[PDB]
Every structure is written in C-alpha cells, then in structure tokens.
C-alpha cells in the first residue's frame, strides 16, 4: 500500500512510515473488510506530506510514527 | 535610359522583337503615353498588381521592367490610346519618383543575339516541344499555335521565352515577372516547370473525368 | 508543382462552393477549413479534419449537409487545441490571491492549498492525477463562483460555469449524430469552446440535481469524465477524436451529499462549503 | 437542366474527394486494408473479410460502407 | 401597454410592443437559418424596423410562456 | 416509365409552387443602396449592410442566398 | 380571374398530391393529432393531450408505461 | 417446368448476388434454394419452401427476410 501511496503523492525517499503507525491506522481510521479504507487514510497522509514539504523542507527523512497522527 | 513617363501595364503584354498594340485608356496614364511619345518616342513599361490605380506609384511598380521604343505614333484621347510600340531589349528599374510623373531609367535600346547556340537551341527545342504538347491539351482552351511556327528562325532564347511564356495563360502577373526578367535560363526553367504543373493537372483532370464516367 | 495543382483543386472547390450550398457562412466555413491548419490541433484532429474535408465540397443542396459541415468546422477550430495558460507553479502565490476573496475563512482554503500543494508537486515524469477533482457542496449563494474565480486568478487561468440542474440524458451530456443541422455536442464542448486554452477550469453546477429519468445515464458519461485518464479518452456523439481532457483542471458545485449518483461517489473528494457568519458577510458588504 | 448540372458537380465532389484513389480517397483505407492481408486468422472468418474486401474503398459523405467495415 | 406608451412619450421616444408567447425556437427570438429565402428574423427585429428610433422601447408580451421543443 | 413519371410529378409540384406570384422591379436595388448609406448605421450595422451591398447587385431575386439577403 | 388562376393552380396541386401515397395515407400520428382537435373538449384536455402527442415518438412501443400513456 | 424456372432463378440470382450486396447476403439464398427444388423432398417441404422461396432475393440488413428464409 504505502509504496503506492508515495507513488501517488510523489514523496519518494521523503517518507518514513513505521508500522506502529499502521497499527494505529487500522485500529483507529478504518474498520472495514478490505484494503480500500487503507488507501483512503494513507492518501490523507500522502497529501498532508506534500503540503508540509513544498512549504519548506525541514529534512530529507520524515519519520511518521504513532504520534504525528492528527496532523496528517 | 533617358527618363520617361512610365506606363503602368495591367492589360497589355508586349513582345521583344515584335510589335504589340498598347491599350491605355486610363486618364492619368494616357497623358504619360502622350508625353512619352513626345519623349523622342520612348516608352517605359513597368507592370503593377499592388492595388490598381492610374498613378505611377513607386509602391505599386516592381523592381523589374522592360523597354519600349515606339513604332507608330498615334494617340486617341477620346478613348483607349491606340499605339503600337516594340521592345528590342528588356530592362530593370533604377529610379523612383512619386508621380505623376514617375521619372525612371531603364536600359539601352539595341538588338540582342545569342553567343552560344548549342545548349541554347537544345533548351529552345525542349521548350518548343513542351509548348506543342501543351497546346494540344490547350485545344479546349483554344489558342492559335501558328504564331510560334512563323518565328522559328529567331534563335534568341529569352525572346522565345517571352513568346511561349506569353502564349500560355497561367497568371498574367507571373507573365509580367517573366516578361521583365533579365535572366533567360531562370525564365526558361520557370516556363518548363509551369508547363510541367499544367500538363500534370491536365492528366489529373483526365483521371477525375474517367473516374466520373465510371461512377456514372 | 503538385501542391500547386492540389491547392488549385482547393480553389476549384471554393469556386464551386461559393455557387451552391448554405453560403452565408460557407466562406466562414472556408476560413474554418483554413483555420484547421491555423488552430494548433493534433494530427488525429488534423486527420478527422481531413475526414470532414472529404465530407466537404458540398456540391449539392444548402439543406443541412453544408451547414452541419460548417458547424463541425466551427466546433473544430473553436474548441481550442494546443493553446494554454502559463500556470502558476506556486501555492504561495495562490494563497496570495486567496488573501482577497472573502478572506477565505481559513477552513477550506487550506484544503485547496493541500490539493494544490500535492499538485504543484506533480511527479512521475508527467502530470498524473490518480485523484479526484475535489467536488464542493453547500447552499448556492455562497462563494462557489467566487472561490473558483480566485483560484483561476491564482493560476492565471480563466473560470467558467456550465450547469447541470435538471439534466437527465447522456443525450444532454453527449450530443448526437451530425447528419442533420440542429445536431450539436452537449454542454461541455461548448464550455471548452468558450475559453481559448487547453488548461481551463470548468465549474459544474448543481450536479446532484441532474436526475436521470429517460434513456441513457448522464452519470455514466460523467464518471467517465471524472476518471483522470478516461477524460483523456472522452468523446461525445458529435465528434470523432476524443479531446484531451487530461490537461484540463476541473471543479464541481452541488448541494446534496446524498442524491449524488453512486459511481460518482468514488473519484470524488467532498469539501462541504460553509454557510457563512454574519461578521464575514458584513465585511464583504462593507468592502467589496 | 439544373438538377442535371447538380448531379454533374456532386460527381465532381466525390471524384475530387477521391483524387486518384489508388492512394485512396483518404489514405487510411489501405492502412486498414493491410490488416486483412497481414493478420493470421481462420479461413471462413478471413473469407468473410475477403468478401467485405470488395465493398471497400468508399468515403464518408459518399458510401458509408468502410465506415462500418474498417471497425468490423 | 398603457404604461409603455406613456413611457415612450415620457421618455420622448417611440413605443413598440410584440409578443413572445408560445415561442419554442429561434424563429421569433432569432432569425431562421440563412440557407433559404423565407428565413425571416425574430419578432424583435420586426419591432426594431417597424419603429424608427435608435432608442426605442420594446415590450415583450407573455414571456412566461416561452419554452423548448426544437431549436433549443 | 412510372418512376420517371413520379419524378416529373414532383418537379411539376415545384413548377406550380413557384407560380401565383412573381417579383419584378429593379429600382429597389437603387433604393436600398441609398438607404444603407441613407440610414446611418454603426460600423457593426453599416459593415453588415455593406456586406449585403457587396453581395447583391448580381442577383437579388435569383439565387436563394441573395434573396434572403435582400429581405435581410 | 385571380380566384380562377389560383383554382387552376390548386387543381393541379391536388392532381399531384393525389398520386403521392395519399398524403402519407393519413398516417397514425397525423390522425391521433386530429382526433383531439376533432372533438371539442375543455381546453386543458387539449393541452395535456397535445403534450402526450409530443411525449411519444421516442420509445419503441415495447415500453410498458409510455404505451399506457398512448392508451390515455 | 416450375422446377426448371426455379433453377433459372436459382442460377441467375446467385450469378448476380455473387457480385453484389448478395455477398453481404453471402449468396446462400440461391445456395439453399437448392434445398427447395434440388433435393427429393415432400410436398410439405415444397409448400413451405415456396412460401419462403418468395422470401428469397431480399435485403440483407434491418430484420432480414432472406437470412431467416435460407435458415428456414
């Protein structure tokens, strides 16, 4: 999924998404019997990332964790 | 040479080595005809297609020209001036004065005869064969072709190009270009390419005509 | 010499077609035929212009045949191909333009900033979307045309409305067979015919009140248009080669989040348009 | 006499939309004609292709036969 | 139309009134197609030509009764 | 012979149809040629009028394009 | 004399109109339009009736409700 | 003699339909007319086969009474 989502946005090499993050996502942002809700939420993360980078580059490596959730 | 009133041609194409009646009935040009025949019988001919006025304008005339020494002094100011002049050597344009009258120099009045004759008469014979096959497809668009066959002794190639180039009607303005050109081989290959596109579109017309009959 | 003969045959067809046919626009038809080579347009479009060029030469009645060919040449050379606005590369400049609209309320203007922030970050060695158009929804008076107006300012593009209230047919979406006059395309080709760029904006109006009650689904052709590559293959009933509708940005106004047709509930992103406060509306009546 | 002249000139229309149709009336007809003689297919199906072959070489404003036959 | 007559007089102009009731097409709103004689313009042009001033007053009658069947 | 008769019937239709009234008089061309210049129209209306003025004066009763231009 | 020349003309009009399939045989949608106007009714009947005249001519008469409209 | 006449129609109609839009009708009309009169059949077959022999030589598109005839 997440490689396709950094293919959607264009944050190739920009994004670190760990997997406690993915646990937080499925436990909090999608309760369905598929993969589509994960496309939607990881799309929200991808879009908010492109916003935070084009306004200014703080780093080249961006750690998304279980702690930056209601910001993306 | 010997600055003249200028006669803007838009309806008569003269020949070198042959008399041609000039038909000028426009009011500001027939005075130039009278004053040029009073200019020791010398007439300076430059055509125009830039919008047709009776003024000798430097913006309407080209940079190419032709001479005309007068062979019959007649003017008829009650209508179109009937005058027969002749060219014996073509010219160019050197001067421009806003008219009336435009004062301009041409070239000298003399006879021109070819030095080389071999490649000259080869291209003359090719052009005569081209006219005599084109005038066969010009039978529907009829023009008499005895007028070339009586002047076969004249081996002047630019004069015969002025003749055959006159004896085929594709565009009067390009015939004014050719009639006023200095260069002879350029006007010869030009008339060859014109007979080329003419006979090629004749054959395309025959193709479409048989196409139509078969569709019938 | 051959082209002299060929354009000579074109002069023959002009000489004949100014003798018969519907002729009070047939020299205009000749200009649009001349405008085929003059409007920058694709070679599939140049080839369908060769097709209608061999549907020209109407050496028959002024009955609709010449007229429908004139209209086809009109819709050719007046829906612009190959012409475009130099876009802005910035969301900072876009925010500079949205400093002036209704102040922009700082709720949805940042969402538009998101959606353009990813789309001033277009990668893939192209411009891919794989994305919605970010549809809008609210009561009608609020700044639908105004917000889209400011965004068209921001990109230095143009803004334009075409409406879809009370539409029910793909016959209203797509046109019909150009075999009689009165055949035209649907709305969208005319909306593009209004602008002179292949990168305009279109504002779709009231699309939840497009309620299909006859043959054909408009929602079918509209979800075709909403798909970011099927628009690039989208064509109507009137036309041959599909207009490249991938270079065209879109935006859409509706009012109901529930009467929207169902495949349109994908390829979509809702931003619910607000019902403004008194103080901001007052500020508008004071300042603008 | 008028409608005679009218038929005469619309024959000119068709034959000058033809323009030596060995090339074609419009040249893309013999580009899809070679998909007959260059695509390996069964004999009855290519036989009805060869029977459609004799109905080819038509324009659009004239006969709309290759209009469907190319697509076929 | 009483109000309209005294409008044109009170404007010192010319009053003219025509009907747009029942119109379905561009036959009486716009003119007919230019490919035939018997194309006559909209009634609006009629109101123009029949009256004489650059500043007329035109009255459009039964405007709630114009709809569409053909010609948009 | 019967289809040639039906042909002849449908053209006797139009021959009877053009009867019952005929247009003559050629001073109307002078009248309208004046009234274009003798009704001072703006360059929109004087331009379209000069177009119809240049279009005519070859026929205005004959060809179906110059007739509706004459009524125009 | 005017009525008599127009009588010759209308004579030959009916003479040609006769031998052309009997005025479409007075086809079905002609006579359906007739019968509403051939019976004097309240006027809103004629309104919704020519309405439902226009509501046809778009289905195939396999329609299980627009046929019910034809019955109405 | 009736069979000889149907043979002559069988021969001439396939000789002409083999050159024409009977190629789109596949010329199976006078190929399966051989099953009408050129195979030993009962008078039931001859009766029905005449009833759809009259349905030979037809148009080939738009609800064809030729293809259902040869099928019959």
Numbering used by the authors:
A (entry chain D): 506 to 577
B (entry chain B): 2 to 217
C (entry chain E): 218 to 505
D (entry chain D), F (entry chain F), G (entry chain A), H (entry chain C): 218 to 289
E (entry chain F): 362 to 433
Original authors' sentences:
The Lon protease is a AAA+ protein found in prokaryotes, archaea, and eukaryotic organelles. Lon is involved in cellular protein homeostasis by degrading damaged or misfolded abnormal proteins, which prevents these unwanted protein species from forming toxic aggregates. Lon is known to form a homohexamer; each protomer is composed of multiple domains, including an N-terminal substrate-binding globular domain (NGD), a long-helix domain (LH), a three-helix bundle (3H), a AAA+ ATPase module, and a protease domain. We show here, using cryo-electron microscopy (cryo-EM), that the activation process of the Lon AAA+ protease may involve a pentameric assembly and a substrate-dependent incorporation of the sixth protomer to form the substrate-pore-loop contacts seen in the translocating state.
To provide a comparative context, we also examined wild-type MtaLon in two states: without any nucleotide (MtaLon-Apo) and incubated with 5 mM ADP (MtaLon:ADP). Unexpectedly, both MtaLon-Y224S:ATPγS and wild-type MtaLon, whether with ADP or lacking nucleotide, predominantly formed left-handed spiral pentamers or spiral hexamers, rather than closed-ring hexamers. The substrate-free hexameric form also adopts a left-handed spiral structure. It is composed of the tethered pentamer and an additional Ac-protomer, Ac6*, which binds next to the protomer Ob1 and occupies the lowermost position of the spiral. Interestingly, the 3H subdomain of Ac6* occupies the axial cavity of the spiral complex and binds to the ATPase domains of the protomers 1–5, effectively blocking the accessibility of the pore loops and forming an inactive structure.
